[PDB]
Amino acid sequence: NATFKNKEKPQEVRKANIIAARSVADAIRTSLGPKGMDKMIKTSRGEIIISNDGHTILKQMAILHPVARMLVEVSAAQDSEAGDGTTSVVILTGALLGAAERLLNKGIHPTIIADSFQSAAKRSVDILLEMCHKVSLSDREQLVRAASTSLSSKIVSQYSSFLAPLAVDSVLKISDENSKNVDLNDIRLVKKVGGTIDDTEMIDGVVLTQTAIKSAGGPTRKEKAKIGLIQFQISPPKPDTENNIIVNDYRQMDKILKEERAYLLNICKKIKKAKCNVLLIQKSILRDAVNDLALHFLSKLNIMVVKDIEREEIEFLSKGLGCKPIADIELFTEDRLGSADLVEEIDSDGSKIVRVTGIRNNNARPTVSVVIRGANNMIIDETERSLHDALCVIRCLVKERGLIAGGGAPEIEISRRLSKEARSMEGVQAFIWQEFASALEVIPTTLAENAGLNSIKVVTELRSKHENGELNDGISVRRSGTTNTYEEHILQPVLVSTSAITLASECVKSILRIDDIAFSR
Amino acid sequence: QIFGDQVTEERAENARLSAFVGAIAVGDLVKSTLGPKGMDKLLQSASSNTCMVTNDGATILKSIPLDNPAAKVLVNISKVQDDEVGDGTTSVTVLSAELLREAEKLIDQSKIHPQTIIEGYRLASAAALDALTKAAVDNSHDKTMFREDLIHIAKTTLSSKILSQDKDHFAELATNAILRLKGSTNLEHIQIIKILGGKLSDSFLDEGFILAKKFGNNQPKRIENAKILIANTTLDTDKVKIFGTKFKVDSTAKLAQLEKAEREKMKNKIAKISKFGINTFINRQLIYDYPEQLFTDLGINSIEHADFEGVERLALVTGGEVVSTFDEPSKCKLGECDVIEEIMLGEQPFLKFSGCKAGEACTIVLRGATDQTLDEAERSLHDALSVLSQTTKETRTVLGGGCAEMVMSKAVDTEAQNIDGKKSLAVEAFARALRQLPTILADNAGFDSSELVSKLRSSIYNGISTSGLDLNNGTIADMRQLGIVESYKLKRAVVSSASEAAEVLLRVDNIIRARPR
Amino acid sequence: KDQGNKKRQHGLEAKKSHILAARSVASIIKTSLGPRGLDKILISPDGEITITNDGATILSQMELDNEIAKLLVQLSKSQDDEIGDGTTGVVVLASALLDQALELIQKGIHPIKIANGFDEAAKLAISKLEETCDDISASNDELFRDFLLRAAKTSLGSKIVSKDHDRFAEMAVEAVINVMDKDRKDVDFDLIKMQGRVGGSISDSKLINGVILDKDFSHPQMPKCVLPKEGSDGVKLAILTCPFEPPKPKTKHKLDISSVEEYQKLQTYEQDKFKEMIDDVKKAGADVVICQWGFDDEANHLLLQNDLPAVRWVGGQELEHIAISTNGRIVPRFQDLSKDKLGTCSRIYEQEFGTTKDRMLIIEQSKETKTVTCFVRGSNKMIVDEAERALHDSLCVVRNLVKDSRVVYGGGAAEVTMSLAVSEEADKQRGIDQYAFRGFAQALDTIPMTLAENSGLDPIGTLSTLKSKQLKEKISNIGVDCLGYGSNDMKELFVVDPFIGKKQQILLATQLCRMILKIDNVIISGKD
């Protein structure tokens, strides 16, 4: 027929936006699930990396299009809020964008699509929450089983009977039965080479990676300590500007050495006047953290020194110990010191790590550090990642209590209900919600295909079994078919499914609303 | 051939076209931003690393340069609207572009001289401005209705902004902030604090004028009967009338003995400050340990790094004087309040005032997840508070949703009934521009603007001059029942600015450039 | 040297080319001729966007290497300095004469015969122009003041100032009178300075008969005003280019101390010299201190304690404005300050203007002045700049009306009368010159026709009406409808141009036409 001439074509931008964004999602889609396919990337440095981790892939895909990049931010939001599902939030975004593209071709204005999808997302969340299996923080074993599940897909699963309760106790030490938001950044995972995977500890004050003092005269241990955090360097005067010292004999060398030593002595005496017992110096390569000459003075003062402490360790210390940074020896005073019952260096299988316990300070906050041990780098790196993910699982359970079955089950349950319920809606409401619900099946569809199963057969079985059955049914790659995934212990926190529904709506809403790209120069 | 040295030159046919094409190019930047359902624009700088998405028409016009020298004129005019009025930026820019867009056709197709168009627009503008006046209704009486009107205005002025998500709460927060004034319209009495953590729905209004910085290293947490003396002075190693004395020694001990001399001179200066009879001392500059201890020993509560905005806000609350010089105990105004208390808002330290001098001040406390969310929330409040504040002097309103625009275009079409020949089409063209706003509003909302606008016009034409667009249901509704109102003063500004903005470029038919540098 | 890379034009082709070059210039500025003329966008070397219809500014901003076009610019410069009115008309008319010259040359009339004919035609045009003149300053002084204001009001109507021009017309009238004595009737334009600030509206503008500084006082606690002090001899002002303190450098000091005895004295010297310098102000007997430089803290306290208000960092011209207005001197040093050097005024005070924080300092004589400043306000820079320049034009009009009382009616009426006279005389020549005399008259017609075209009027119906009315009814000046008034006949509309203005416009445009017509060779080299 004859219709809108469409001389000005804003749809050309939205089409470019959707095409670019969906391309990113389809690339990630094929890596979904324990049976997913690997991606290989050649980096700008020429290195070859292989991974099936969606977020790691997305960062290295080096997406250019200003709008397609937003799908990377979505995975970052998922990693920040939930810590899991980072691949699934982009995949659902891609499928929902495909729904939007079809709806646009059907004559639905992008404004209608964005708002209607938001309404569908609201109902999707309600459907998800009602169907979950509730948990309680009071049930320590239940928390261990939740962590143990996420640990069963790690490289060294034989120690999951240890890493699970470690993650559980680490959270419980700082989060009681009545908590909403737990920031697991207060649970510091500290690695050190040596020992074994089970050989871990939970420390209240801090675990540091560095030694204290090895030289003669050092106290090596202090009880009832006040602790300061140093960001300055303690070294003889060493300016950057032009300077010269002339020494023609040992007599002048003696004078010069006394000038250098007296400088450090005055610093060390002021530190003593502040009644500081332990110095924790932030790592820097500008000047010596604490010069040997200063260590001789500080040792005689019975002051412990820990050097080359990483920024991240310093930031944790400022919360666990109740102590404050000192920017310069000029301002080094008591008001900036914390407290601790015991500061000691532990040498276990050559560890030699300084730790603090018994802070008992009003400035302290519920923090905990975990000692990760292991012979090979792969052991301490795998353990840290394993505990981190386990902590993210528990954090999710606090924010929104409960787990749902995996294997695409909540996507079949939500889609199935929405497709039926949408039939009672009017106008664009029903037509759009049918496309929204259909988009959700990209997850159980992809899981079936990556598992080597017939795509239509599995989804057909999932539809039929959910109509007669319940959420517990889903795809099990271990059983290579549709079975009771709850009984197979394939469980994900509610927050992961809830967040994915939200992010998919927010991203598509954001993409559809962009009708132009302009430069600001 | 004249000119040279690679200058730009455009003659009647080219410069005239450029004037209109330029203005249209400006309109194309913001035509999508009109209404609560407007579309977003993605902006990216040459570095690629500043990519942002916004529907704020003012940001887009300021962020996106245009190379058309006539477009630069309209953009600069739109800037004035945004900075001086605080609202109407998109509406003026659209109406200006549409008034000039029709003017292009009037010259090329209707054989209308630019001078005829300008005079015709002036006549039509008077009709539109009169239409606003006759349709303008106040509730100056019955304070209950005035307060309600402010809430309805607030919800409208928050439209298209991040705050539109929770407008039910922020409409009352903004309204109460203005109602609290019972006095000056100056927004400098209202403070906004941006705190991370929580949701926007958790924002609070606190009439206690909350300060972002606390006082003292080791000083009491509450000041009773505070007497406020503000400073902008250097107190650090201040060598008073002993200038030119340097410290050169052969030992550290001697140097420390000499540093005492600086303490003695600072002690005199700090003592002279204490002679004012004060409890609280605020310095825009930093206060080193010596003057800090000297204040503490004399019982003076020390605040440092009180920046320009802080000092100016204190002047409007405590009533003190910045006093950059403290050589005499008199010739200074001192402020006062009943209580200064250290208070935690969202686990962040502040001070809370009570009993300040003739208090008209209040603070709106924002709770957001991201800096970008809070930055948009802060600006959105500023814009809404300006219109709500101005309403307290001009209490008349008109109906929105395209209603006022149809009423104005109705008057303009009526004016064209009694008009000379040449100017007739210009007057009708003015009306056609006016009705573009309800067209854009419907289009952005994803509705059929041709049906809604044509039917709306027939409603306003055949009496029923209460109707307007329902941009949520996609139909025509009574704006009084829905509560869709816009400030009379703002509508006068939008029509006035759009009319003059068009005239500026209507008077241009040549572009002359000097040698570039 | 380096004969190549040069341009040259000569001969019959140069005559066509040169006239076309002149036409190109006119084709731009002609569009701004008239009270309804269209504006230009003028783009500076830095990309600054300004809008104006001032032909003098436009031609000044037109940067060109066409030597014939440059001659037209030189014409507009002469008119801008001499009269200040016809800066567009003299170029448009000169082009019109050159356009007629083109046809005359093509028909076989030698350029010299054209130049001579145009000269004689100009003499006829002025001879008739005199017959239509009348006096404004004649008879009752009240009529002079009435017409003088009305002339300013009309001259303002071509710029944005037209909105509230009633106030700016008054400023022009008061400004020209305030610097002019009734007996001599000579106006020195340099006695009327223009000044303005961003803020407020143009309706807030006013004429200030004193000196205004855009500077604040040396110390916030220092008194902001000095009054005559209950009948004393006004206010005594100390105007200097040196601060009342021991001067200190901003670069190197190089002050060598050879002994401790000197060290202690040197520190004391500075403290004492601060006192001595302020004490010298009291010895002079000054009330206020105005210095090119600011003051140190010690000087501010000493000036404060002794009630000696002082203004800091006052610019060169601002110091001269005070010295001139107050009939004083600028004294480089302090030892010469006395009643014989200090300036006198009646009041010095700080004036606030609504929410504008400029807080200007105004020095008043409160009596007849030798100089005035026109204070312009407005909501933006371009508004102030244009309204301020609008006063410049109006000041030129009232300047010419004071100097030469003879005026003629404008709106193109004078050109039509002169065109008719030259046309009627042309038929009496019976010789070759008849072609140039008719051409000259046709060139004059281009002015009322331009006024028609720039107003949206038919120039053919308009000119036909203009000539018909001045032949059928009465030679009396008949104007055009360019102002949108109910009818023409400027006698009731008060659109009046000075005689000396219109006389120079016609003579100078004719001389310029001859300046270009006589050019038979142009050689252009490079630019170093």
Side-chain angles (χ1 to χ4, degrees), chain B residues 5 241 244 327 507 515 517, chain C residues 39 45-46 63 263 298 301:
Chain B
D5 294 326
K241 300 185 186 296
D327 291 320
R507 290 175 58 87
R515 183 175 179 177
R517 181 167 64 178
Chain C
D39 300 337
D46 296 319
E63 294 180 355
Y263 182 81
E298 289 294 309
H301 285 307

Side-chain angles (χ1 to χ4, degrees), chain A residues 226 262 264-279 297-298 301-303 329-337, chain B residues 252-253 256 259:
Chain A
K226 294 183 180 179
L264 293 175
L265 176 60
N266 287 339
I267 291 169
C268 295
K269 287 173 69 176
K270 288 179 181 179
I271 290 169
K272 189 69 171 181
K273 287 180 179 179
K275 308 297 183 183
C276 183
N277 301 118
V278 182
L279 308 181
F297 289 123
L298 293 168
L301 294 171
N302 296 310
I303 297 170
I329 67 95
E330 185 177 0
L331 303 178
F332 196 104
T333 190
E334 186 175 0
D335 287 349
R336 295 175 185 266
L337 304 178
Chain B
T252 299
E259 288 178 353

Side-chain angles (χ1 to χ4, degrees), chain C residues 12-209:
Chain C
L12 181 61
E13 290 178 354
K15 299 294 178 182
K16 182 176 179 179
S17 180
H18 293 168
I19 292 170
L20 290 173
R23 187 177 299 164
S24 294
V25 172
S27 76
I28 296 170
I29 68 171
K30 182 176 71 175
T31 61
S32 296
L33 181 61
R36 303 295 179 183
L38 296 179
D39 300 337
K40 275 62 179 295
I41 295 173
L42 303 183
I43 304 168
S44 81
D46 296 319
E48 186 178 0
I49 307 301
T50 64
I51 299 173
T52 186
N53 61 346
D54 177 4
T57 299
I58 293 165
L59 287 169
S60 295
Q61 292 298 305
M62 286 173 68
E63 294 180 355
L64 56 81
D65 286 332
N66 182 305
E67 291 301 309
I68 299 302
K70 288 182 182 176
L71 290 172
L72 289 174
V73 172
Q74 290 177 358
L75 172 63
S76 69
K77 182 64 165 62
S78 295
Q79 188 64 0
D80 192 61
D81 291 346
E82 184 68 18
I83 304 298
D85 61 351
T87 60
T88 302
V90 296
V91 174
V92 171
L93 178 57
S95 179
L97 290 170
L98 291 169
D99 284 342
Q100 289 287 332
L102 179 61
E103 290 180 356
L104 290 170
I105 291 168
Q106 291 172 338
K107 291 178 179 178
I109 309 299
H110 194 281
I112 290 170
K113 292 177 183 177
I114 296 169
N116 288 340
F118 282 170
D119 189 74
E120 290 295 308
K123 288 182 174 65
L124 292 175
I126 297 304
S127 295
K128 188 70 179 177
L129 187 62
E130 289 178 354
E131 291 186 359
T132 62
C133 295
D134 204 353
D135 286 321
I136 298 301
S137 68
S139 190
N140 192 324
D141 288 346
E142 290 179 353
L143 292 172
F144 175 77
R145 289 178 180 172
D146 183 22
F147 286 120
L148 187 64
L149 180 62
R150 289 176 184 272
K153 287 173 66 71
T154 298
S155 67
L156 294 169
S158 64
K159 292 180 173 68
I160 196 169
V161 73
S162 66
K163 177 179 181 291
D164 298 317
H165 68 280
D166 288 345
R167 184 60 174 162
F168 291 87
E170 290 173 354
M171 291 169 66
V173 169
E174 290 178 355
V176 73
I177 292 168
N178 286 339
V179 300
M180 175 273 288
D181 64 277
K182 188 174 181 179
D183 293 347
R184 186 174 172 178
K185 300 179 175 60
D186 285 340
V187 177
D188 180 349
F189 190 93
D190 195 52
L191 296 176
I192 304 170
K193 300 297 186 184
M194 279 76 73
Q195 186 176 13
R197 304 287 293 183
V198 175
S201 67
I202 63 170
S203 72
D204 297 316
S205 303
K206 63 180 182 179
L207 183 67
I208 301 172
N209 294 330

